[PDB]
Amino acid sequence: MSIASIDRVAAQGHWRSRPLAEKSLIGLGFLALAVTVPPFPGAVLVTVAILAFTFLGARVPLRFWASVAVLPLGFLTTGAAVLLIQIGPEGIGLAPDGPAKAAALVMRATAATCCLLFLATTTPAADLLSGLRRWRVPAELIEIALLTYRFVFILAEEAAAMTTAQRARLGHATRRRWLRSTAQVIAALLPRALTRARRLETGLGARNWQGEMRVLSTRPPASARVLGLILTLQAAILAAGVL
């Protein structure tokens, strides 16, 4: 399942120090394209672009991501197969031109997902959430979201532990047993959370405040240099993609 793997990778390789400002362009930009770009010319050279960036630009050890990557591929194998198919008042058939409308779906998605994956392998969910500073989204919900990210790993930890304990004591023998149990880790996870909230509030009241949450970040300011350069590249691969 979950997912401390990706999070810790996103905070240990070469490109996590270098500004949010532009990895959220390389990411969010090429993402925007793939969806927009007509595919065959387009998301093909986008893929190799973000892929370069992912493996060459920010060498990310995987290489191995596709363990991360694959989880998508089982979902669209069917989606693509839907388009392949079907229907009318006739039992029956393959579609006229299924295999293009399908292989145009694959290359668009995989592309956009490599954009995702790039973001999700090099930028830590935290950063991306502070970035919404600069657009609308009012301060509060950023604090909450920065805090939701926080409790997610101080509930993940108690959950792993709990599952582990049942799992001994033979959590696992029947199957119905397994469901039963897992409930006994979800039921027993709501109050632990709520309480973990209130000992947060008392703990922080140390400083002369409990709410608010102003913090100081140590990220750098992606000079308008790579700004220009990256932006041009993308706009290009557009133009060419829209050719």
Partner: protein, 258 residues
């Protein structure tokens, strides 16, 4: 001279409940290492809670430096700035997506712009030898490390008095000893150390004077010299002495004749 933090009574309990914090007016004298003591259910974790202002006792007043603060609201903000708390569970004062981002909470809702606050954080991170753990995320930190952070985030504000609560819980004697340094270093800089514990030998390693209590009142508050030692005095609470020397009938940090 006049104590820096002295608490009256102080008094406290649960409502509809057993006792919480009888009337124990412990006085601390600026620039020492007091070590509240016992194995808890006594409520040292609760005592501290009144000495920052977290808890308003039903009766008790504690007076900081010379006179008494206006709790219930507003004042406490001041009290906190002076007096600091480091709880047992480091995950109760760290929200704190990274270390820097955490510590830096302090001086920011403490009263300071951006450049200086950064400066202040950078001071505290090195003050706990975590300047190389600056931008890595908290939940990716060993238990000890995150106390060091929740202490850092506290010493980032400059308190005179620093309360601690079990500051060696689940530390190996390595990480325990190299901690010791970092806060003996703090008292040496001038900071009043106050702390709950139950491994006795700690107070035999850091403390100037020792407090003792079961029930809720403190029953024994003198030097760790003739506390640590007077076993009978130990006796009333459940404990025993640090190893020291068994007999003085001849005629804490190891010395020896032999």
């Amino acid at each position: 001279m006049t104590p820096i933090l002295a608490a009256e009574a102080l008094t406290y309990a649960f409502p509809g409940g057993v006792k919480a914090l009888d009337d124990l007016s412990l006085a601390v004298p600026k620039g020492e290492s007091l070590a509240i003591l016992g194995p808890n259910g006594a409520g040292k974790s609760t005592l501290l809670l009144h000495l920052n202002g977290t808890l308003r006792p039903q009766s008790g007043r504690v007076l900081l430096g010379g006179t008494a603060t206006g709790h219930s609201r507003k004042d406490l903000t001041g009290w906190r700035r002076r007096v600091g708390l480091v709880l047992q569970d480091a995950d109760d004062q760290l929200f704190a997506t990274t270390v820097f981002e955490d510590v830096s909470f302090g001086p920011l809702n403490l009263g300071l712009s951006e450049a200086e606050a950064r400066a202040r954080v950078e001071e505290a991170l090195a003050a706990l030898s975590i300047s190389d753990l600056r931008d890595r995320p908290t939940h990716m930190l060993s238990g000890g490390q995150k106390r060091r952070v929740a202490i850092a985030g506290a010493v980032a504000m400059r308190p005179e008095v620093l309360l601690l609560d079990e500051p060696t819980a689940g530390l190996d004697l390595a990480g325990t000893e190299q901690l010791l340094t970092l806060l003996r270093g703090l008292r040496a800089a001038g900071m009043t150390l106050v702390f709950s514990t139950h491994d006795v030998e700690l107070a035999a390693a850091l403390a100037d004077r020792v407090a003792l209590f079961r029930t809720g009142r403190v029953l024994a508050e003198g030097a760790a010299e003739a506390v640590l030692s007077d076993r009978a005095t130990l006796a009333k609470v459940a404990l025993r002495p640090p190893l020291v020397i068994d007999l003085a009938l001849l005629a804490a940090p190891l010395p020896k004749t032999r």
